[PDB]
Design a protein around this ligand. Structure first.
Ligand SMILES: [Ca+2]
Length: 312
DNA sequence: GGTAGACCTGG
DNA sequence: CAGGTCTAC
């Protein structure tokens, strides 16, 4: 009973809650949607993963978000630990208000988003986010999730073990920048991405100023932030936009891939004006990204998540 | 200065 | 061929 992953019903006394109706957050819509790849629904409707360097299990009901953390001597989440969960889901950002704004300026959203409330962006760590998305090249959520999982098992610090699952924190810069890491990563199937992880871990640490550099980008402007990241090997416009949108607090960033194009040509009859190329291209993509930022406003990136979900 | 191609591996 | 990046035309 005191073993394995917990459930709200099995170990009641060890849970705490955060007021949050499903209209504000839908775990099943956000945790496996491809923002973070470290959450698993071990028990139905129960998600487990590493948040703030500790293992948590989250599950929601009516107007509550239930949290339980595995640090000894158990005990429900504390006032502050639960606060970390709040910052992670950026709950202070009200979706009810955003859906209202986007819906009032975009009829197609109005309809489409009705059946998909509770979609929002996670406030991730710049490192985990930088390296996870460097691995998303020529890949899908399932592939990426696997790679990222073996990567932490191999170089991340061992947290705690639940059932036959051992949790690891995301690798540090020192670890990814170490000797022979690229070779190690290739054995884990990362392919050519192995080079970028390693090259990028070294660049931040030996050419840019380390962790601080990355972090400091949360205070910089979207344009500065975007430019900075692109400096890294394996980090282009797309990955830079994801990192900006997902870890550096830039809600206006709008990552453009052939997917966003499909949603644009099918639900808006969008077409490139400036750039000549009709298919995706550096210039046409930038243009497409500007279209949505003009259409949805500052949180264009959050609106995109909503559509991607409903398009599933 | 904008556009094919290789880089790993597997569904 | 794939939710990308890098580089030689
Ligand atoms: Ca780059």
């Amino acid at each position: 009973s005191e073993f394995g992953h917990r459930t709200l019903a099995s170990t009641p006394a060890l849970w705490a809650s955060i007021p949050c109706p499903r209209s504000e957050l839908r775990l099943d819509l956000v945790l496996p949607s491809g923002q973070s790849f470290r959450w698993r629904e071990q028990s139905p409707a129960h998600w487990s993963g590493v948040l703030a360097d500790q293992v948590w299990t989250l599950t929601q009901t009516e107007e509550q978000l239930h949290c339980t953390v595995y640090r000894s001597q158990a005990s429900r989440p504390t006032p502050d630990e639960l606060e970390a969960v709040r910052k992670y889901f950026q709950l202070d950002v009200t979706l009810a208000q955003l859906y209202h704004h986007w819906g009032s300026v975009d009829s197609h959203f109005q309809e489409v988003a009705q059946k998909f409330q509770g979609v929002r962006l996670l406030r991730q760590d710049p490192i985990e986010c930088l390296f996870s998305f460097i691995c998303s090249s020529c890949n899908n959520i399932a592939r990426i999730t696997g790679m990222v999982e073996r990567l932490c098992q191999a170089f991340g610090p061992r947290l705690i073990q639940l059932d036959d699952v051992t949790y690891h924190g995301f690798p540090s810069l020192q670890a990814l920048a170490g000797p022979e890491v690229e070779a190690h990563l290739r054995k884990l199937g990362l392919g050519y991405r192995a080079r970028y992880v390693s090259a990028s871990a070294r660049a931040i640490l030996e050419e840019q100023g380390g962790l601080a550099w990355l972090q400091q980008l949360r205070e910089s402007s979207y344009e500065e932030a975007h430019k900075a990241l692109c400096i890294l090997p394996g980090v282009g416009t797309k990955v830079a936009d994801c990192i900006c949108l997902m870890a550096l607090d830039k809600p206006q960033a709008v990552p453009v891939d052939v997917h966003m194009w499909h949603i644009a040509q099918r639900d808006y009859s969008w077409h490139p004006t400036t750039s000549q190329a009709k298919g995706p291209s550096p210039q046409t993509n930038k243009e497409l990204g500007n279209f949505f930022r003009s259409l949805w406003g500052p949180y264009a990136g959050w609106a995109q998540a909503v559509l991607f979900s409903a398009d599933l």
